[PDB]
Amino acid sequence: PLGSEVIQALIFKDDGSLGLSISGGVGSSSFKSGDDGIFVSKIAKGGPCDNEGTLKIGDKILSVNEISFTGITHEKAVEILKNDSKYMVVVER
């Protein structure tokens, strides 16, 4: 209805995890049609990402702590998200 929305969310880790599972990436099978990118493919109920409440499944991750996630691999995104306790994630919905 509003088109692509740039949403922002600050999530704090718990038990070395952010509570979200990602899919996609450059060199990977696309999560959506002809769109490489890191997508929130799952949200663990009761986890940090769920308890914050801003992110939703299907969002393309655009940035994580000002690290551009556009044009990166799936393995690079996993390597980044598994570093710090605070995560400022910017997504497009």
């Binding site: 599972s21 990602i22 060199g27 990977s28 099978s29 493919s41 799936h74």
Partner: peptide, 8 residues
Amino acid sequence: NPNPETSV
């Protein structure tokens, strides 16, 4: 192409 879903 690989289609991975990684828990983070």
